[PDB]
UniProtKB/Swiss-Prot annotation:
Motif (Cx9C motif 2): 28-38
Family: Belongs to the CMC4 family.
Keyword Disulfide bond: yes
GO cellular component, one term: mitochondrial intermembrane space
Stored InterPro entries: CMC4, Cys_alpha_HP_mot_SF
Disease: Overexpressed in T-cell leukemia bearing a t(X;14) translocation.
Disulfide bonds, paired cysteine numbers: C7-C38, C17-C28, C39-C50
Compartmental location: Mitochondrion
The organism's place on the tree of life at top rank: Eukaryota
Span(s) of short sequence motif Cx9C motif 1: 7-17
Keywords attached to this entry: Chromosomal rearrangement, Disulfide bond, Mitochondrion, Proto-oncogene
The protein's name in its UniProt record: Cx9C motif-containing protein 4
Main location: mitochondrion
Length: 68
């Protein structure tokens, strides 16, 4: 929603984790797991970043691995 996004705090941590890991979404799987758990706590459309996340979950599942 274009409202207070509960998960956007955690999304910041994903983004910055990525920079701390040179964009290795592999290393940021931990913190992504936290945005996952954050996202799944709500009716997904509640949050913009979470609405990105269930797509990221599909992406990671399509990737079938902790790759990238």
């Amino acid at each position: 929603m274009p409202q207070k996004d509960p998960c956007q705090k955690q999304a910041c941590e994903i983004q910055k984790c990525l920079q701390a890991n040179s964009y290795m979404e592999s290393k940021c799987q931990a913190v992504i797991q936290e945005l996952r758990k954050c996202c799944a706590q709500y009716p997904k459309g509640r949050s913009v970043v979470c609405s990105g996340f269930e797509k990221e979950e599909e992406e990671n599942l399509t990737r079938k691995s902790a790759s990238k």
